[PDB]
Design a binder for this molecule. Structure first.
Ligand SMILES: NC(=O)C1=CN([C@@H]2O[C@H](COP(=O)(O)OP(=O)(O)OC[C@H]3O[C@@H](n4cnc5c(N)ncnc54)[C@H](OP(=O)(O)O)[C@@H]3O)[C@@H](O)[C@H]2O)C=CC1
Ligand code: NA
Length: 358
């Protein structure tokens, strides 16, 4: 009689033990005419998933989940994590025009929506794209969240594109993870010269992906090494913290060189101080740092993941043209999501961890 479906959900924030498997998920529902229901075939685990499991961003994300303050506390639960999906379209609302049942699609889901570690996921038409024809679901599911994060930082915030990168020198701090391994490749597709900073053991990987130079950040003479290279037109910082104290100094000055960071206290400030005071603090940091770097002749920018079907269509074109490859470290069956989370939580990513749902 009833329709039941499967998911990994959490009922409270905490350590990995909060993960719970249920075969009693309700059927997915189209609430708005621009939504699409997708059968999840594969999903990837992202550090944002492990962090959100522990409560990270809860304050800000709850405001996003319920703008009106019309829901009660703990109303996000049960919460399905997972941001990436490769799969097949089951149903569309009446305003979706470019997708239909049976299409093979991928998407990155915003953090404030129910996630993809489930049999089905509801997404908005503007977040979804036809997946690369050349990739399996497993391969494709590794890409959307990291690719869109990289795209936001590089293209949208950085202003770099296929026409203006030729012979620009790019530094990627943290080149061996999900974002970095995508970033190396999109930058080489646009003919930039790429310097990758990563651990010694990742060096072969990042070179095969197209890194021109590699710096081992534990080599103990990173400064003399960077000092020995020409300056950079662009730095993508995926490490953060102390990197900001030395890395901007290696950009060309007074030439529109840009430092973009993906590691910010945006969500942490609101967790610690609340929405109003956290947002204030974030603004003070943003404003003082932008001006201070402007005075030293560089643009300093923050960048964030942003969901985009149209950007995914551009990415799928690069994949199918052979310019971007998926980099999958490991796959886990659906029954081993907790194990996949522990692996991610242990660190030292070399590309991506994918969950096979089908
Ligand atoms: N603002 C935003 O919207 C987003 C920000 N991000 C940021 O980027 C990271 C997540 O991205 P992702 O690419 O998926 O993460 P990963 O976990 O897949 O990759 C991070 C990589 O960084 C390496 N690393 C750690 N320390 C250093 C260092 N000091 N120098 C060079 N490499 C280092 C790790 O390897 P090893 O430790 O072995 O060197 C690992 O390969 C997080 O820090 C996250 O905040 C991610 C998504 C969205
Ligand atoms: Na598969």
């Amino acid at each position: 009689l009833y329709f039941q479906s499967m998911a990994w959900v959490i009922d409270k924030y905490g350590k990995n033990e909060v993960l719970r498997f249920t075969q009693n998920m309700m059927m997915p529902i189209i609430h708005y005419p621009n939504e699409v229901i997708v059968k999840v075939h594969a999903a990837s685990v992202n550090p944002i998933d492990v962090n959100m499991r522990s409560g990270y961003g809860a304050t800000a994300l709850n405001m996003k989940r319920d703008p009106l303050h019309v829901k009660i506390k703990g109303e996000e639960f049960p919460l399905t994590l997972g941001r990436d999906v490769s799969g097949v379209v089951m149903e569309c609302g009446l305003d979706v025009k470019y997708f239909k049942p049976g299409d093979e699609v991928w998407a990155a889901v915003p953090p404030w929506k129910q996630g993809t570690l489930s049999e089905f996921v509801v997404v908005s038409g503007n977040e979804v794209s036809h997946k690369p024809k050349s990739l399996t679901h497993t391969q494709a599911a590794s890409l959307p969240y990291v690719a869109l994060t990289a795209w936001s930082a590089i293209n949208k915030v950085g202003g770099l594109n296929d026409k203006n990168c030729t012979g620009k020198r790019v530094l990627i701090l943290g080149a061996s993870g999900g974002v970095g391994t995508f970033a190396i490749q999109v930058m080489k597709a646009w003919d930039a010269h790429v310097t990758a900073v990563c651990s010694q053991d990742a060096s072969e990987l990042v070179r095969k992906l197209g890194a021109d130079d590699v710096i081992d950040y534990k080599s103990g003479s990173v400064e003399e090494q960077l000092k020995s290279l020409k300056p950079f037109d662009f730095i993508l910082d995926n490490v953060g913290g102390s990197t900001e104290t030395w890395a901007p100094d290696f950009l060309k000055k007074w030439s529109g060189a840009t430092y973009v960071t993906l590691v910010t206290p945006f969500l942490l400030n609101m967790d610690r101080l609340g929405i109003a005071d956290g947002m204030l603090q974030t603004g003070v940091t943003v404003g003082s740092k932008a001006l201070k770097h402007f005075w030293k002749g560089v643009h300093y920018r923050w960048a964030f993941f942003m969901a985009s079907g149209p950007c995914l269509d551009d990415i799928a074109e690069l994949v199918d043209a052979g310019k971007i490859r998926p980099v999958i470290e490991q796959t886990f069956p659906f029954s081993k999501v907790p194990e996949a989370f522990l692996k991610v939580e242990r660190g030292h990513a070399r590309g991506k961890t994918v969950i096979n749902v089908v």
